[PDB]
Amino acid sequence: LVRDAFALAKEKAPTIIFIDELDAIGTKRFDSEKSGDREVQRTMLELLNQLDGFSSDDRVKVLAATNRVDVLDPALLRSGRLDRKIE
Amino acid sequence: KRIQSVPLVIGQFLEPIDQNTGIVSSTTGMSYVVRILSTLDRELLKPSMSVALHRHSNALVDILPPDSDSSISVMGENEKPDVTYADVGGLDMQKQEIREAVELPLVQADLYEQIGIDPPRGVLLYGPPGTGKTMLVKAVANSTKAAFIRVNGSEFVHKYLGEGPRMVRDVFRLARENAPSIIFIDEVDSIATKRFDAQTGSDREVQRILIELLTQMDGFDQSTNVKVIMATNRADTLDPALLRPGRLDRKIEFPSL
Amino acid sequence: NDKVRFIKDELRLLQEPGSYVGEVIKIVSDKKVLVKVQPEGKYIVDVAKDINVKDLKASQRVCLRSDSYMLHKVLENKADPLVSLMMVEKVPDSTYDMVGGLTKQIKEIKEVIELPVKHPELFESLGIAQPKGVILYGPPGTGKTLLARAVAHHTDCKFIRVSGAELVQKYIGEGSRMVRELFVMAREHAPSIIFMDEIDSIGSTRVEGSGGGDSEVQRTMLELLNQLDGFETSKNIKIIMATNRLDILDPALLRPGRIDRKIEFPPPSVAARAEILRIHSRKMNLTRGINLRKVAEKMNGCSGADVKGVCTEAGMYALRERRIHVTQEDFELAVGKVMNKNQET
Amino acid sequence: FVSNSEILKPFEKKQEEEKKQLEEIRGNPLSIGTLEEIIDDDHAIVTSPTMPDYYVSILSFVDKELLEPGCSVLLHHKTMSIVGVLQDDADPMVSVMKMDKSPTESYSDIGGLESQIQEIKESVELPLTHPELYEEMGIKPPKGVILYGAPGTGKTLLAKAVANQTSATFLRIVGSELIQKYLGDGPRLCRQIFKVAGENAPSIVFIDEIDAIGTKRYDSNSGGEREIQRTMLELLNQLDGFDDRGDVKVIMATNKIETLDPALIRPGRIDRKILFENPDLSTKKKILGIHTSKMNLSEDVNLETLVTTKDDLSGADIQAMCTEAGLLALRERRMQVTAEDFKQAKERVMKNKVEENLEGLY
Amino acid sequence: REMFAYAKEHEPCIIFMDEVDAIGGRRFSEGTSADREIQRTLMELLTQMDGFDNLGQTKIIMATNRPDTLDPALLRPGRLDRKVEIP
């Protein structure tokens, strides 16, 4: 869905891909419990790999929203990934 | 005989209903009641032989040898294992174990029955594979001049009534035909993790597969000239149906300590 | 002349498109049968004019015409072992002659199970009730599961081992359904032994009972037993529980009218061990010079199951040395191995 | 008679002609499928297994209101027309329910529970005896009662008796089987139990030993197991949100009524809270007398004597005694029972029940 | 199989398998929800290494966030020899 989400996003540019909630997929567990919840880890990872797989362009924006922040990761960091952290 | 003619679908003959009648299982999973040719009989046919059936008329035209092996679900028959038992050392205790388990009923069938005690028929290798474990299996298989048949247990894990439960028919049968043979089943636990602790996922799809394993296995190893050896990452997630005495009499560990 | 005609008839015959295999869901009164066909979906068909629908019954595997939709034949009915697992074993092979050491158990087991089933009339005449459940508690795998099968061979019933967790499906009811169906099966097959498998271990059997579905399932069974003495006041199907642990039990469960008899399974003694050995040796080629009194005395901290291991390990030593007749020398050597395994942990 | 004949002669000719016009539709192969929904243009959408889905007008044998969404139906094999209604197949999944029509048990067999027997009689029994009577008056009697003691001592028995009196279906519901280890799963299992109860009224619903699906906690949802909490809230919503006069009566069972949430008790449905008294000497005599009517025994057995030396035994222990003394007779191959059997029997159950830890006394 | 098969034909080639935790986990609570499909993928992988399919000029790289669901079997060389960290 995400690889299609990004492909259509590239086609549609300027575009804001608005992602409500980023703790709903933003759990991914940290133990051997990720096995179960692999759908939620994989979807979150797939947008970040795609974002870093291009740089120095602003054709697609993705903007993420949380109801209450409880998720942040060292993986999110990088400039082509989620650069901006606005409170 | 002449009238039916080629081109043809492949099926496996399930069972004789009577004279000139069969229930056949087509290998797209779909089972049919058909006529058979009067030139082919009850003793020219068997419950898991491969048969040629007509495409539109569905009647048993000709008998095929079993020799079909799937290749996009991956069932390997392996001439030429090339590893021996001096590829890995220090395994003395597991070596001796394997030798008496596997070699000896094939070579010396007569002497078990002459004593009047049960042979071993099933062996379980438990512990991590590919440590030198797989190599002993492969070394015996070449040394005894048995066929090595590498069976992916987990690639039965097909997602319908189609191919998978029929892949099981052919593989046990084919091993018996080209006897002596080793059937080495890599990770049986895929088609055998079920309920034990009431925290186990969907287990219905696998269920049909397990049942034909039970039929094929007890249906051979009675003249003891093909052995079945199962391998699994962890053994605490097998069914008792596999485990029980009369099947699985040897339980070999990759030893520790 | 007939042989020429016969071939001719076959030549014509073969030009059919074939029949479909189907499963009867149910017979109805309308001259129709509801068939779940296996190549295709589900169909209502009108059976042949050559039979009724009271000449049929549900759960039959059938041959249905692809052309005229009439049940041309009935094959056989779906076999009693089904679901994730469950094993029904017709004609139990075990007997009190297959294991020895059971002098203590024999008088005890006879009154609790045999005398009610075999004579209902006595129980009734006395006004003693039939016990609802039996619990057996003892050292594991010695021949506890084996005894159950023995009593079932004498009373002339199928021994039905039911795996508690396999009755643990992840869907709505389907699981609850299986539990109900089971009772239906054993009511039909009355008399029957239901042996509740998986609150014991024979060594080759996983899961000894747990905090999940083995203790809860064990409550369910008791409920059923209450109900039978209730509306129908007919009861011919008895449940036998086996356990090794008192942590699967609670006092209302042992309270008379759920479990009425608590029978001790034989703790293993030197005399008992010789007996069992003698029975298993009376199948195979062992020398007469052997002294079962010696072999029995060598073994301490060995069950019934261990004795069986000794005999096959002994055979493997002769066999290697290329002989078919076993000796005392092999029997000691085999015992010494088995003994070390009990000394671990 | 004469009446049958008047009818037979026109009825025959019309029936054949109708039967025929139906059978031309109904002709094989016709595939079974299930009705998804009924659209309000008087069409209807049907789900076929073979993957037609179509909007078709009904054809009679049934009416549009003799059908509901999700019903099983008979489908035409090209237009998928609803020719008729059929009954579910390929295994209707129904949840563990034990059916007992008129379970054989009465008040008389367990008499000496006198105080409880009146309480259950007013609340459960008499409303079931009066069906149109509950429809006309309209006001609620007790919908439901709770019985708390020990099972098969009064709790099982009392509910069995009242079921026999009113010719109601008695439905024994296994508390624990609703304790499935899945999510979504507990409440839909619980709901299914209530669905079937209302369909097949009259019935008494006996829910055996609710504490495994319960456990009150301190909060109404907690970060522990979710499945045990889920089944509990569905159970609380099912009393609170549908109420009955008399058509379904609920008997709930638990050994300890204080492990249940106080809002799951809910006054205005469960009005009766019934508890268990201990036997006095006279009750022991009564409970004993019944159990021996069904035995045959020796006439040197004295009821009074056994009773005096028994002290603090409940009826369950009294039942066990009858079987244990009777077992020694069956060992001696005798269908009388002597005085002696009873004495040893009385003593033994008495001993085991009557464990001392010095917690009495004071 | 196809992917490895083509890497050997056209070798050298890198098979970069992202998240071998969805395709070679080892459970944590022993479910097979879709986790038998996990066994199928892991199994295939082992077979090619363990067999007579020959990698040496054909290279495999696995990537996984935290190592917690790799069997002792993979940690044996001739599977994964070299295990590189990020400091």
CA distance D204 to D166: 10
CA distance D16 to D12: 6
Resolution limit, Å: 7.7
With both helix axes pointing from N to C terminus, report the angle between D281-293 and D315-331 in degrees, rounded to the nearest 10. Answer: 40
CB pairs under 8 A between C and D: 158
CA distance C33 to B176: 42
Helix (H) or strand (E) holding B231: strand B226-232
Reported residue count of chain D is 362
Strand intervals (E) in B119-197: 122-126, 147-152, 181-186
Cβ–Cβ of E18/A45 closer than 8 Å? yes
Q: In 3D, which of B32, B69, B38 has the Cα closest to residue B54?
A: B32
Best mutation target, A27, A29, A32, to test chain E (most E CBs within 10 A): A32
Q: What is the DSSP string of D12-64?
A: HHHHHHHHHHHHHHH-SSEEEEEEEE--TTS--EEE-TTS--------SSS-G
Q: In 3D, which of D317, D204, D335, D100 has the Cα closest to residue C229?
A: D100
* Residue B68 at interface with chain E, using a CB cutoff of 8 Å: no
Strand, helix or coil for residue B133: helix
Cβ–Cβ of B100/C166 closer than 8 Å? no
CA distance C101 to C143: 10
Residues whose CB is less than 8 angstroms from the CB of residue C5 and which lie 6 or more positions away in sequence, other chains included: none
Cβ–Cβ of E29/B199 closer than 8 Å? yes
Which of E:7-46 have CB within 8 Å of B?
26, 29-37, 39-40, 43-44, 46
Helix (H) or strand (E) holding B53: strand B50-54
D29 touches D77 (CB < 8 A):
yes
Q: In 3D, which of E8, E2, E22, E85 has the Cα closest to residue E52?
A: E8
> Tokens 């032989």, residue?
B49
**Residue numbers followed by a gap, chain D, C–N over 2.5 Å:** 178
Q: In 3D, which of A28, A15, A25 has the Cα closest to residue A60?
A: A15
Best mutation target, C231, C235, C260, to test chain D (most D CBs within 10 A): C231
Residues whose CB is less than 8 angstroms from the CB of residue D31 and which lie 6 or more positions away in sequence, other chains included: C40, C41, C42, C43, D48, D49, D50, D75, D77
Strand, helix or coil for residue D206: strand
The method of structure determination was: cryo-EM
* Residue B225 at interface with chain C, using a CB cutoff of 8 Å: no
Task: Return the ∠ at Cα A66 (arms to A60 and A71), rounded to 5°.
Answer: 100
CA distance D272 to D116: 10
Q: Which of chain C's residues have a Cβ under 8 Å away from the Cβ of D95? A: 173, 176-177
Q: Torsions phi, psi of C313, nearest 5?
A: -70, -35
Q: Torsions phi, psi of E46, nearest 5?
A: -60, -35
A81 touches A51 (CB < 8 A):
yes
Cβ–Cβ of E31/B152 closer than 8 Å? no
Distances D204 to B250, D109, D173, D188 between C-alpha atoms, Å: 55, 20, 11, 21
Q: In 3D, which of D285, D335, D334 has the Cα closest to residue C127?
A: D335
Q: What is the 3-state secondary structure (H, E, C) of C210-230?
A: CCCCCCHHHHHHHHHHHHHHH
CA distance B78 to B83: 13
Residues whose CB is less than 8 angstroms from the CB of residue A14 and which lie 6 or more positions away in sequence, other chains included: A59, A61
Q: Is the peptide bond before E12 cis (omega within 30 degrees of 0)?
A: yes
Residue C326 DSSP symbol = B
Task: Return the ∠ at Cα C197 (arms to C195 and C200), rounded to 5°.
Answer: 115
B249 touches B101 (CB < 8 A):
no
With both helix axes pointing from N to C terminus, report the angle between B207-218 and B164-177 in degrees, rounded to the nearest 10. Answer: 20
Burial (CB < 10 A; 0-12, 13-18, 19+), residue B1, is middle
Cβ–Cβ of A36/E21 closer than 8 Å? no
> Tokens 């070394």, residue?
B139
Q: What is the 3-state secondary structure (H, E, C) of D235-262?
A: HHHHHHHCCCCCCEEEEEECCCHHHCCH
B147 touches B79 (CB < 8 A):
yes
Best mutation target, A38, A43, A50, to test chain E (most E CBs within 10 A): A38
Structure tokens at D19: 């039967």
Structure tokens at E26: 């080892």
CA distance D103 to D165: 9
Cβ–Cβ of A33/E28 closer than 8 Å? yes
**Cβ atoms within 10 Å, residue B183:** 23
D179 touches D229 (CB < 8 A):
no
Residues whose CB is less than 8 angstroms from the CB of residue B87 and which lie 6 or more positions away in sequence, other chains included: B132, B135, B139
Which of B:50-79 have CB within 8 Å of C?
56-59
Helix (H) or strand (E) holding E77: none
Task: Return the ∠ at Cα B44 (arms to B38 and B47), rounded to 5°.
Answer: 110
D173 touches D219 (CB < 8 A):
no
Q: In 3D, which of E21, E30, E44, A33 has the Cα closest to residue B203?
A: E30
CA distance D50 to C201: 47
Q: Work out the end-to-end distance of chain D between its first and last CA atoms, rounded to an integer number of angstroms.
A: 83
CA distance B66 to B47: 12
Cβ–Cβ of E35/A49 closer than 8 Å? no
* Residue E61 at interface with chain B, using a CB cutoff of 8 Å: no
C71 touches C64 (CB < 8 A):
yes
CA distance B99 to B96: 5
